[PDB]
Design an enzyme around this catalytic site. Structure first.
Site, PDB file in Angstrom:
ATOM      1  CG  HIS A  16     -34.087 102.565  43.383  1.00  0.00           C
ATOM      2  ND1 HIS A  16     -34.014 102.637  41.942  1.00  0.00           N
ATOM      3  CD2 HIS A  16     -34.228 103.520  43.979  1.00  0.00           C
ATOM      4  CE1 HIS A  16     -33.821 103.888  41.858  1.00  0.00           C
ATOM      5  NE2 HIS A  16     -33.940 104.568  42.906  1.00  0.00           N
ATOM      6  CD1 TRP A  86     -30.362 101.137  40.948  1.00  0.00           C
ATOM      7  CD2 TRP A  86     -30.474 103.411  41.236  1.00  0.00           C
ATOM      8  NE1 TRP A  86     -30.992 101.608  40.056  1.00  0.00           N
ATOM      9  CE2 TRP A  86     -31.081 102.867  39.959  1.00  0.00           C
ATOM     10  CE3 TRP A  86     -30.559 104.556  41.493  1.00  0.00           C
ATOM     11  CZ2 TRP A  86     -31.836 103.686  39.151  1.00  0.00           C
ATOM     12  CZ3 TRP A  86     -31.264 105.364  40.357  1.00  0.00           C
ATOM     13  CH2 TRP A  86     -31.737 105.065  39.220  1.00  0.00           C
ATOM     14  CE1 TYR A 132     -39.812 103.784  26.726  1.00  0.00           C
ATOM     15  CE2 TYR A 132     -40.442 104.417  29.064  1.00  0.00           C
ATOM     16  CZ  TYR A 132     -39.558 104.121  28.065  1.00  0.00           C
ATOM     17  OH  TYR A 132     -38.641 103.431  28.684  1.00  0.00           O
ATOM     18  CG  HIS A 169     -37.214 110.790  35.185  1.00  0.00           C
ATOM     19  ND1 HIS A 169     -36.916 110.594  33.898  1.00  0.00           N
ATOM     20  CD2 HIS A 169     -38.009 110.172  35.912  1.00  0.00           C
ATOM     21  CE1 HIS A 169     -37.727 109.637  33.519  1.00  0.00           C
ATOM     22  NE2 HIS A 169     -38.519 109.412  34.538  1.00  0.00           N
ATOM     23  CE1 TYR A 184     -41.383 107.695  36.737  1.00  0.00           C
ATOM     24  CE2 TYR A 184     -42.652 106.705  34.799  1.00  0.00           C
ATOM     25  CZ  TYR A 184     -41.428 107.344  35.425  1.00  0.00           C
ATOM     26  OH  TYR A 184     -40.001 107.383  34.871  1.00  0.00           O
TER      27      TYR A 184
HETATM   28  O1  V1W Z   1     -36.861 106.752  33.235  1.00  0.00           O
HETATM   29  C1  V1W Z   1     -36.929 105.458  32.790  1.00  0.00           C
HETATM   30  N1  V1W Z   1     -36.845 104.315  33.385  1.00  0.00           N
HETATM   31  C2  V1W Z   1     -37.247 103.301  32.458  1.00  0.00           C
HETATM   32  N2  V1W Z   1     -37.842 104.074  31.164  1.00  0.00           N
HETATM   33  C3  V1W Z   1     -37.817 105.369  31.477  1.00  0.00           C
HETATM   34  C4  V1W Z   1     -36.890 105.905  30.277  1.00  0.00           C
HETATM   35  C5  V1W Z   1     -36.858 107.410  30.200  1.00  0.00           C
HETATM   36  C6  V1W Z   1     -38.127 107.998  29.869  1.00  0.00           C
HETATM   37  C7  V1W Z   1     -38.123 109.527  29.845  1.00  0.00           C
HETATM   38  C8  V1W Z   1     -36.837 110.190  30.420  1.00  0.00           C
HETATM   39  O2  V1W Z   1     -36.906 111.664  30.404  1.00  0.00           O
HETATM   40  C9  V1W Z   1     -35.699 109.478  30.752  1.00  0.00           C
HETATM   41  C10 V1W Z   1     -35.587 107.892  30.898  1.00  0.00           C
HETATM   42  O3  V1W Z   1     -38.896 105.885  31.532  1.00  0.00           O
HETATM   43  O4  V1W Z   1     -39.323 106.308  32.883  1.00  0.00           O
HETATM   44  C11 V1W Z   1     -37.175 102.209  32.572  1.00  0.00           C
HETATM   45  C12 V1W Z   1     -37.652 101.229  31.664  1.00  0.00           C
HETATM   46  C13 V1W Z   1     -36.386 100.338  31.077  1.00  0.00           C
HETATM   47  C14 V1W Z   1     -35.616  99.448  31.652  1.00  0.00           C
HETATM   48  C15 V1W Z   1     -34.699  98.887  30.811  1.00  0.00           C
HETATM   49  C16 V1W Z   1     -34.526  98.873  29.586  1.00  0.00           C
HETATM   50  C17 V1W Z   1     -35.448  99.939  28.970  1.00  0.00           C
HETATM   51  C18 V1W Z   1     -36.516 100.341  29.461  1.00  0.00           C
HETATM   52  N3  V1W Z   1     -36.503 101.678  33.887  1.00  0.00           N
HETATM   53  C19 V1W Z   1     -36.101 102.640  35.136  1.00  0.00           C
HETATM   54  C20 V1W Z   1     -36.303 104.101  34.413  1.00  0.00           C
HETATM   55  C21 V1W Z   1     -35.724 104.954  35.562  1.00  0.00           C
HETATM   56  C22 V1W Z   1     -35.151 104.543  36.680  1.00  0.00           C
HETATM   57  C23 V1W Z   1     -35.064 103.138  37.240  1.00  0.00           C
HETATM   58  C24 V1W Z   1     -34.728 102.648  38.188  1.00  0.00           C
HETATM   59  C25 V1W Z   1     -34.521 101.361  38.302  1.00  0.00           C
HETATM   60  O5  V1W Z   1     -34.217 100.766  39.820  1.00  0.00           O
HETATM   61  C26 V1W Z   1     -35.106 100.569  37.502  1.00  0.00           C
HETATM   62  C27 V1W Z   1     -35.570 100.736  36.364  1.00  0.00           C
HETATM   63  C28 V1W Z   1     -35.553 102.275  36.067  1.00  0.00           C
END
Ligand code: V1W
Ligand code: CA
Length: 189
Positions: A16, A86, A132, A169, A184
């Protein structure tokens, strides 16, 4: 799949830290929910031409998720306080998970997937994920996008299911599963 917390583990903290720095674009060590939501709606949803109901739904889920880790409009958050929020978020998420309550990451994922495939299969093209990965910046490489689709259990069209990503996730962000390790690629440790 694992349900216990490992917050004292230096590997969870580092994961994180990487994402906080990623959110701290200006490098000053502070982030705000204002910036996060701007990034969600004005930068990601506007670019994807999502509907107002879709943009509002996506922004609602982003607001909820980051309020879950202690963020709030008008409040500057530095990494120690982000990390402590977190632990609270992951504990909430595992509790809702263990009761089959929709998690905040489940709800955000549903909202993201609803943009690419509209309302239907809830699956996304690599072309769509690469989009994305680049728009959100979480994985701007077209190469790293490839490795996640190789890490996940895909379906028969070569497309990723939000059901699959949600399971990955909960391991990758909350409990530190080694088959979530690599989610990732080498783009998020
Ligand atoms: O999971 C998703 N994240 C992210 N976009 C995601 C969206 C997603 C895709 C598929 C899924 O099924 C579920 C969610 O794509 O991965 C962003 C990108 C983002 C951040 C702020 C505003 C908009 C976008 N930031 C973090 C994060 C996850 C944990 C984090 C833990 C952290 O400390 C910090 C960031 C994330
Ligand atoms: Ca900053």
């Amino acid at each position: 799949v694992k349900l216990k917390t490992d917050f004292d583990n230096p590997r969870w903290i580092k994961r994180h830290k990487h994402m906080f720095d990623f959110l701290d674009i200006n490098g000053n060590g502070k982030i705000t929910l204002d910036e996060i939501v701007s990034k969600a709606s004005d930068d990601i949803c506007a670019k994807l031409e999502a509907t107002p109901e879709q943009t509002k739904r996506h922004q609602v889920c982003v607001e909820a998720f980051f309020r879950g880790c202690g963020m709030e409009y008008g409040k500057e958050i530095a990494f120690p306080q982000f990390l402590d929020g977190w632990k609270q978020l992951a504990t909430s998420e595992l509790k809702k998970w263990a009761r089959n309550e929709p998690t905040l990451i489940r709800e955000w994922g549903d909202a993201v997937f609803d943009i690419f495939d509209k309302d239907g299969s809830g699956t996304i093209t690599l072309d769509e994920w690469k989009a994305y990965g680049k728009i959100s910046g979480i994985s701007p490489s077209q190469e790293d996008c490839e490795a996640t689709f190789r890490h996940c259990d895909l379906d028969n069209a070569g497309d990723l299911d939000v059901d699959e990503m949600t399971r990955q996730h909960l391991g990758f962000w909350y409990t530190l599963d080694p088959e979530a390790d690599g989610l990732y690629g080498n783009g998020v440790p």
